[PDB]
Amino acid sequence: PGAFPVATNGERFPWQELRLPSVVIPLHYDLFVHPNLTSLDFVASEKIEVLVSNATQFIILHSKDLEITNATLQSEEDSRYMKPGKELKVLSYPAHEQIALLVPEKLTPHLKYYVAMDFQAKLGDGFEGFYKSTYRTLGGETRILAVTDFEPTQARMAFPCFDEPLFKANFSIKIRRESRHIALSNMPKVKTIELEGGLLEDHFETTVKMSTYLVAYIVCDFHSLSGFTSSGVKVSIYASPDKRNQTHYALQASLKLLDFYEKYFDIYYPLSKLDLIAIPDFAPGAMENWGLITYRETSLLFDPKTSSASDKLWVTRVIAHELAHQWFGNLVTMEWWNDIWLNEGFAKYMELIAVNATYPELQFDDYFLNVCFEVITKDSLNSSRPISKPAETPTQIQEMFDEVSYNKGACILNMLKDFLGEEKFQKGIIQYLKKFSYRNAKNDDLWSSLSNSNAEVKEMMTTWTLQKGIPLLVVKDGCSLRLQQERFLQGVFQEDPEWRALQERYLWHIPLTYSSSNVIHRHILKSKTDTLDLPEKTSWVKFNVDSNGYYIVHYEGHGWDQLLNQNHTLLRPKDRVGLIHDVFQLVGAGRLTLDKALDMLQHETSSPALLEGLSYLESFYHMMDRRNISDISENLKRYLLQYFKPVIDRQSWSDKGSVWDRMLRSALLKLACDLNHAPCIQKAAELFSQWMESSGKLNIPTDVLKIVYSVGAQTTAGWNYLLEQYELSMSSAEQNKILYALSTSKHQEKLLKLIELGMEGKVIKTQNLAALLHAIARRPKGQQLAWDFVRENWTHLLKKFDLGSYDIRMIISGTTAHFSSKDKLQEVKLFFESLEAQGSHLDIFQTVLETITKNIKWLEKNLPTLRTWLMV
């Protein structure tokens, strides 16, 4: 009997596992909220029409930090619980964030009973649940709004509910409010009824079946700009009144993208309205609430006096990602958080399609390669995880929202789009959605639908979704296709006794694909060793075409050395950087050395190739200047300026030209005075002080703003003028760049004053705190200050953030993942074991542990080689 947990009233709680029981099933939530924005609290009532199916003496559902005052169980059918119904005993067990409704009788199956509850709480101050946010206006008034953010386990802090994504229901919502506020929610507002006190109550149309984590409601004081999509949907971009000017690109871009998705998926967006609102203190980048999409202001609003081409590119990506979610996640959602990549993998992949086919000017296809690359860094260590993987606690579910779920989800999806061909792919995607509309899909179900566009493909992708890591292609004599696959790793060489893990079951059904002329050959590799015959022999032979496959190519002999250092356009531009990328991880990996590492092309015109390789050189400089040895840094510095002096001088300090043109300019001039190369750092200072002496009158071109501001930080008369003007500005894009601009100063106290105002949270919003730290810790001057500060104020940072939070995740790897010493590796082994003193376990612990360990062993056996490039 008494094998169960104690409740808060000392009674034993009738359920013992974190997943909810399956016997009670909700169908309909009627939901009343009455928030008060001066009292900063709310009162709320709720009726859940839950259909029983098995005998049960107790209903179980979730609730957190809510005071439940009344709880009644009516029934229309089994009329023992007929009107007024009976009053229910309510037990609470917080360690599973669950409550037990103890019925006095026993519920009997196939009947519908109606659970009503009254509940109340204060508006959150943690930027989760139903919480309070502030914003500044043009005159410096601050006004208050009440927002919801629920993904993934936080809706249970706003109303008691069955808070698992499989428990889809309908949700009618009513909200009481003052006359000076508007109320928005998922659906459009049906009617407004004026009441006794001068208050209004807004009723909203019932929703389609959906998960709890998409329910939304806001109370605020915003204006909007509206337009209509071809389909029959009204799109409104809401924001603070003094920023309605900044909403123009978003309504344009939203109209196109939703037009695209409706035809591309061949499913109409099923709501009458879709609204996009720029929440000023917002923790996520944005959030795919059905019909009411919340954005960070820097993610939605675009001011052409203040915003990069890169910032226009960021806004349009996030407004593709979040519209895509309306199908991947809202229409179809994973049955449980283990297959979270079904929403996020597909959303991040759909963004690449949408922007490419809607905004070609922005040139997003050539950029996409980076996202796999970032996940490959993670995926190449043993700390990584399979794309689908069990997940039970809250903070463990929040761990599933990583670059494995987004980037690698998006890239292995990209692989299969190459193999089956976009035609068969798009038909499969449409069959997948239409089948699973308003329901829940498991990891298997997507492929079992995608395959029938071929029972072969299902176990092919089994190798990719259920197994950790990234395969390695070993090719080995004329027509020599002696294929052998491995598990690519890093910091573990064939020499080492650690390397036996390269052999466990690690067998990928890699869909290899090649060319030795302008034609691609396609063939599967389902075994450790298999092979082919070359038709005739050729100069070079390259497999990974455009790196569209999630594997790195290693030619076992005499193939690398050709690379065409004279005519490079023999090999296509994507394969150009594909080869560049592969010829550094192979260096770290253990097979190749660094002498061929710097092999690469001062006459490369595709900037993707140019920036990718040069960004690779940036890392070498920074990693060495961070340990303060100029013996290898100075050679890297003016090497890059002399050799890349033509290109650098060509650029014209203004925001003119095309998008990769404009991005190449700021990227190039970044280094240009991140190096104290006078010709241009001197340039900034006269523009800088022309503007600083103009006092907001001079206009600086877009693509140089972050550079100019950054340059003029060092003079305290500037740094103090930048901080002061930060407060004044009405562009979150502009003030982000200022905030970077103040992280550049090398004054240890000026740096920490920035951090002190973040902790306070009023002048610099708390949403920016982690990024502010992360910027500082990247400079060598502030690198140790940040590391010190986090360890000194840990318990306070943890009171701000949820610890499965992204801010906590970005603060620790932002402060530690750039280390390369054995000194710091033990010191970070401590304080990770110091925080498992408390119940604080995060996989990012090992990912960063192993990441500094791989930084040691890449200096341990690779730097001697690179001192050897002194020129003169």
Ligand X SMILES: *[C@@H]1O[C@H](CO)[C@@H](O[C@@H]2O[C@H](CO)[C@@H](O)[C@H](O)[C@H]2NC(C)=O)[C@H](O)[C@H]1NC(C)=O
Ligand Y SMILES: *[C@@H]1O[C@H](CO)[C@@H](O[C@@H]2O[C@H](CO)[C@@H](O[C@@H]3O[C@H](CO)[C@@H](O)[C@H](O)[C@@H]3O)[C@H](O)[C@H]2NC(C)=O)[C@H](O)[C@H]1NC(C)=O
Ligand Z SMILES: *[C@@H]1O[C@H](CO)[C@@H](O[C@@H]2O[C@H](CO)[C@@H](O[C@@H]3O[C@H](CO[C@H]4O[C@H](CO)[C@@H](O)[C@H](O)[C@@H]4O)[C@@H](O)[C@H](O[C@H]4O[C@H](CO)[C@@H](O)[C@H](O)[C@@H]4O)[C@@H]3O)[C@H](O)[C@H]2NC(C)=O)[C@H](O)[C@H]1NC(C)=O
* Angle (nearest 5°) at CA 610 between 605 and 614: 155
| 148 φ/ψ angles, rounded to the nearest 5 degrees | -110, 140
Report what 241 binds from ligand Y, ligand X, ligand Z, none; CB cut-off 5-8 Å by kind: ligand Z
Burial class (CB in 10 A: 0-12, 13-18, 19+), 728: exposed
Report what 225 binds from ligand Y, ligand Z, its own copies, none; CB cut-off 5-8 Å by kind: ligand Z
When binding is defined by CB under 6 A, the residue of 140, 197, 478, 497 that contacts ligand Z is 197
| Interaction of residue 203 with ligand Y, rule CB under 6 A | no
Amino acid in the structure at residue 4? F
C-alpha 412/C-alpha 468 separation (Å) is 13
The secondary element (H helix, E strand) that includes residue 634 is helix 630-643
Contact segment (CB under 6 A) with ligand Y among 205-213, 535-543, 700-708, 793-801 equals 205-213
Q: Which is nearer to ligand 7OO, 347 or 460 (CB)?
A: 347
DSSP 406: I
Q: Which is nearer to ligand 7OO, 50 or 278 (CB)?
A: 278
Tell me whether the omega of the peptide bond preceding residue 535 falls within 30 degrees of 0, making it cis.
Answer: no
Q: Which is nearer to ligand Z, 242 or 599 (CB)?
A: 242
Report what 38 binds from ligand 7OO, its own copies, ligand Y, none; CB cut-off 5-8 Å by kind: its own copies
Q: Which of residues 409-468 bind ligand Y (CB under 6 A)?
A: 438
User: What tokens does 1 get?
Assistant: 């009997």
Strand, helix or coil for residue 29: strand
Least distance in Å: CB of 15 to ligand X? 13
| Interaction of residue 178 with ligand Z, rule CB under 6 A | yes
Which among 853, 843, 863, 865 is positioned nearest to 492, based on CA atoms? 853
Strand, helix or coil for residue 146: strand
| Interaction of residue 37 with its own copies, rule CB under 8 A | yes
| Interaction of residue 227 with ligand Z, rule CB under 6 A | no
Given 322, 399, 486, 612, the catalytic residue: 322
Strand, helix or coil for residue 69: strand
Which among 603, 581, 605, 617 is positioned nearest to 664, based on CA atoms? 605
C-alpha 502/C-alpha 331 separation (Å) is 40
When binding is defined by CB under 6 A, the residue of 9, 22, 39, 538 that contacts ligand Z is 39
| Interaction of residue 284 with ligand 7OO, rule CB under 6 A | yes
When binding is defined by CB under 6 A, the residue of 5, 241, 390, 696 that contacts ligand Z is 241
Per-residue interface string for the shown chain with ligand Y, residues 156-195, x marking contact by CB under 6 A: --------------x-------------------------
Residue with token string 């869909």: 511
Q: Which is nearer to ligand 7OO, 425 or 806 (CB)?
A: 806
Residue with token string 């890169």: 310
When binding is defined by CB under 6 A, the residue of 224, 382, 562, 846 that contacts ligand Z is 224
Tell me whether the omega of the peptide bond preceding residue 152 falls within 30 degrees of 0, making it cis.
Answer: yes
CA 313 to chain centre: 16
Report what 144 binds from its own copies, ligand X, ligand Y, none; CB cut-off 5-8 Å by kind: its own copies
| Interaction of residue 285 with ligand 7OO, rule CB under 6 A | yes
Helix residue ranges, H only, 266-393: 297-300, 309-325, 341-358, 369-379
User: What tokens does 767 get?
Assistant: 């949403």
| Interaction of residue 529 with ligand X, rule CB under 6 A | no
| Interaction of residue 759 with its own copies, rule CB under 8 A | no
Report what 28 binds from ligand Z, ligand 7OO, ligand Y, none; CB cut-off 5-8 Å by kind: ligand Y
Residue 486 bears catalytic tag: no
When binding is defined by CB under 6 A, the residue of 7, 13, 26, 28 that contacts ligand Y is 28
The secondary element (H helix, E strand) that includes residue 119 is strand 112-122
When binding is defined by CB under 6 A, the residue of 47, 209, 622, 626 that contacts ligand Y is 209
Q: Which is nearer to ligand Z, 224 or 689 (CB)?
A: 224
Residue by residue, what is the 3-state secondary structure of 721-761?
HHHHHHHHCCCHHHHHHHHHHHHCCCCHHHHHHHHHHHHHC
| Interaction of residue 124 with ligand 7OO, rule CB under 6 A | no
C-alpha 21/C-alpha 28 separation (Å) is 18
Least distance in Å: CB of 16 to ligand Z? 40
Max CA-CA distance within the chain? Answer: 94
| 634 φ/ψ angles, rounded to the nearest 5 degrees | -60, -35
Q: List beta partners, residue 113.
A: 50, 75
Least distance in Å: CB of 335 to ligand 7OO? 17
Per-residue interface string for the shown chain with its own copies, residues 109-148, x marking contact by CB under 8 A: -------------------------x--xxxxxxxx----
C-alpha 478/C-alpha 516 separation (Å) is 12
Amino acid in the structure at residue 146? A
Burial class (CB in 10 A: 0-12, 13-18, 19+), 122: middle
When binding is defined by CB under 6 A, the residue of 120, 206, 356, 715 that contacts ligand Y is 206
C-alpha 297/C-alpha 279 separation (Å) is 6
Q: Which is nearer to ligand Y, 51 or 144 (CB)?
A: 51
- Judge contact between 393 and 840, C-beta under 8 A: no
When binding is defined by CB under 8 A, the residue of 25, 27, 40, 641 that contacts its own copies is 40
When binding is defined by CB under 6 A, the residue of 152, 291, 394, 471 that contacts ligand 7OO is 152
| Interaction of residue 112 with ligand X, rule CB under 6 A | no
| Interaction of residue 156 with ligand 7OO, rule CB under 6 A | no
| 842 φ/ψ angles, rounded to the nearest 5 degrees | -135, 130
What is the contact surface with ligand 7OO in residues (CB under 6 A)?
151-152, 283-288, 321-322, 325, 344, 347, 398, 401-403, 406, 806
Q: Which residues bind ligand X (CB under 6 A)?
A: 28, 53-54, 170, 206, 208-209, 438
Residue numbers at the binding site for ligand Y (CB under 6 A): 28, 170, 206, 208-209, 438
**Which stretches of the chain bind its own copies, using CB under 8 A?**
37-40, 134, 137-144, 180, 242
Residues annotated as part of the active site = 322
Enumerate binding residues for ligand Z (CB under 6 A): 36, 38-39, 176-178, 197-199, 224-225, 241-242
